[PDB]
Design a protein around this ligand. Structure first.
Ligand SMILES: O=C1NCCc2[nH]c(-c3ccnc(-c4cnc5ccccc5c4)c3)cc21
Length: 295
């Protein structure tokens, strides 16, 4: 006994409206247009619905995302319909619904507490688990941005989840103990960008602005673009003046220009600042206030 097998992906073919109420309310915009809010007729719970045109690229997204839904920090696909819509075959993905909206909106909507270093570590921890899960099953997510980190609720014990698989990609014997990873097949620097994303999201969490900011004109967005190439960014005071040299070093290691230089997800999770989420200094960060400065 003891055989943990979860179930396979099942493309439902009946009309989705047979099983759910479909609203006009929008929950997100993508290249495939709207994410809608819907309601399960039976249970009456709320779900997000993403609609893609059926085709090989769409199918992969679904498949990868289904594969990854077993991860606690990745938006769970709850079921998938293939229907006809204007004589065009379609994939309708029904996922769990993340009311807490986007990661940054939440921080920026404190302003009456203060957002500690430790709170950020915990955040980065949970994004890490998501990447970790992904990479260990040989998927690179490849669009890990702010916009795709949302919260299950407004409740402060909300759990933070990764969404959007439109750019995810697969990365893919008896004397094996000693064989070097490079001999176990190709897989060229592909999951390493997920690592860069992580650096950026960490930078912003700690201060409230990207490490590579625009400016507009010339050498200010064409230059903002070489700024990235050169890997040039500061830790300007007085935001960073109070931040652990250990943390700076961690960002520095994620924001490495040459991808093979950059840290692995595994190395990441074993890092003390991430591994001791709990015992990180309670120190007050500017983040929330700085965020409030915008459009
Ligand atoms: O895959 C995607 N591509 C485009 C952006 C996006 N949002 C979602 C999404 C998924 C699940 N829930 C939501 C969501 C739910 N409820 C919300 C309430 C208030 C603000 C944002 C919300 C987002 C968005 C998925 C995708």
């Amino acid at each position: 006994p003891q055989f943990h097998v979860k179930s396979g992906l099942q493309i439902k073919k009946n009309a989705i409206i047979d099983d759910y109420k479909v609203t006009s309310q929008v929950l997100g915009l993508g290249i495939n247009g709207k994410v809608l809010q819907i309601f399960n007729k039976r249970t009456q719970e709320k779900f997000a619905l993403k609609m893609l045109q059926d085709c090989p690229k769409a199918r992969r997204e679904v498949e990868l995302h289904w594969r990854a839904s077993q991860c606690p920090h990745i938006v769970r696909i709850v079921d998938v319909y293939e229907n006809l819509y204007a004589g065009r075959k379609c994939l309708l993905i029904v996922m769990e619904c993340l009311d807490g909206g986007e990661l940054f909106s939440r921080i920026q909507d404190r302003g009456d507490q203060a957002f500690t270093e430790r709170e950020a570590s915990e955040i980065m921890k949970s994004i890490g688990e998501a990447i970790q899960y992904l990479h260990s099953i040989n998927i690179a997510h490849r669009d890990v941005k702010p916009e795709n980190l949302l919260y299950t609720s407004k409740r402060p014990n909300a759990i933070l989840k990764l969404t959007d698989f439109g750019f995810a990609k697969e990365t893919t014997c008896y004397t094996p103990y000693y064989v070097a990873p490079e001999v176990l097949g190709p897989e060229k620097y592909d999951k390493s960008c997920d690592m860069w994303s992580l650096g950026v999201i960490m930078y912003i969490l700690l201060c409230g602005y990207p490490p590579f900011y625009s400016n507009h004109g010339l050498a200010i967005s064409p230059g903002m673009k070489t700024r990235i190439r050169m890997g040039q960014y500061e830790f300007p005071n007085p935001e960073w003046s109070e931040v652990s040299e250990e943390v700076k070093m961690l960002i520095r290691n994620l924001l490495k220009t040459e991808p093979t230089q950059r840290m692995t997800i595994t190395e990441f999770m074993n890092h003390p600042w991430i591994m001791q989420s709990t015992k990180v200094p309670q120190t007050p960060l500017h983040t929330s206030r700085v965020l409030k400065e915008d459009k």
